[PDB]
Design a protein around this nucleic acid. Sequence first.
DNA 1: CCGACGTCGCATCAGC
DNA 2: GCTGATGCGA
DNA 3: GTCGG
Length: 314
Amino acid sequence: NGGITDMLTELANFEKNVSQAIHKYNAYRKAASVIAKYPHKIKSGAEAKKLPGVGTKIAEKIDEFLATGKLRKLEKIRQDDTSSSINFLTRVSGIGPSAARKFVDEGIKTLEDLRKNEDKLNHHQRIGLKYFGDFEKRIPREEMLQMQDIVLNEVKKVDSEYIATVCGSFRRGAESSGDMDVLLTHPSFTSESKLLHQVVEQLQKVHFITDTLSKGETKFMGVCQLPSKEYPHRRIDIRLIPKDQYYCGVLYFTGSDIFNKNMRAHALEKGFTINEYTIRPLTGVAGEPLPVDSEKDIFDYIQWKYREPKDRSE
DNA sequence: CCGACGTCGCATCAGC
DNA sequence: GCTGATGCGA
DNA sequence: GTCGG
Ligand SMILES: Nc1nc2c(ncn2[C@H]2C[C@H](O)[C@@H](COP(=O)(O)NP(=O)(O)OP(=O)(O)O)O2)c(=O)[nH]1
Ligand SMILES: [Mg+2]
Ligand code: NA
Ligand code: NA
Ligand code: NA
């Protein structure tokens, strides 16, 4: 069904990027995902329509695609200069639907036009521009291992009591990642209580961290690069998490996004709620955080077969 | 018919 | 100067 | 755009 899901993803992008209709963006994604998992070749819109997330308007477009191998709206929007320029610019990290509109309105449409107009870009955007190609390359696990080796080593160096845990697709054992996600704790930061700055500073000292998109007391977002053809520049996030909310942190930032969604809806059916900090019991009556001393406890609570990070794709 | 559609930390903007 | 709203990327 | 109160 690849043709149909490429069509739907491309509509979703225009809804988000150009139309600024986030809810139609999500509805097309929701339908692209349920169509992706469906083990038959779709022969009719009405057959699609059986699936949850596929309604009458997507059914119509499936039929037009089946009968013609395209949609008239999509062909038109691609041949539209304004729209397709707005869509493209949002590929720069730090340029969203709003900024891209503003650039395009004032004649700024390509990376070329962005490279000529630095004065009109915020700091995040300049970094996104500067690393445009690099931020779209993937990261083989062998480099993620090398990035990790470095991260754990410098972290332990600053203070032996830190615990650093690489999460995201890495922890799930993916053969390649889009980026590095790192979680951080320390005995002297819990909910009852420079810890991130010091780590970031050390990783800048040894030339691992090359730029900074944003930085606060608990969330850093930035760029790194392995030491030396020189490696691509890579996205890295580091979050400082309360030691006593550690396991909820690791679950959430281990993901995937789609597994967390799943686990959060199941947590509804069994009368609990889960964010990155806590699991709390719910008549909608979300009370106090529960004790947690393993990822498993969180599965124990909502009665779910514990799952290996390995198996948290869906 | 019409409201819901996750939540979060940080940077930047609007407005007093 | 400050607070609160919004943009952005998860 | 899809769903469901
Ligand atoms: N609430 C929320 N959480 C998210 C979202 N996206 C991701 N997460 C959570 C779930 C993720 O597990 C975690 C890391 O975010 P990523 O680095 O963008 N995704 P990953 O590491 O899994 O894949 P790769 O890096 O290979 O692209 O953050 C989101 O949109 N919303
Ligand atoms: Mg990641
Ligand atoms: Na349906
Ligand atoms: Na962007
Ligand atoms: Na990430």
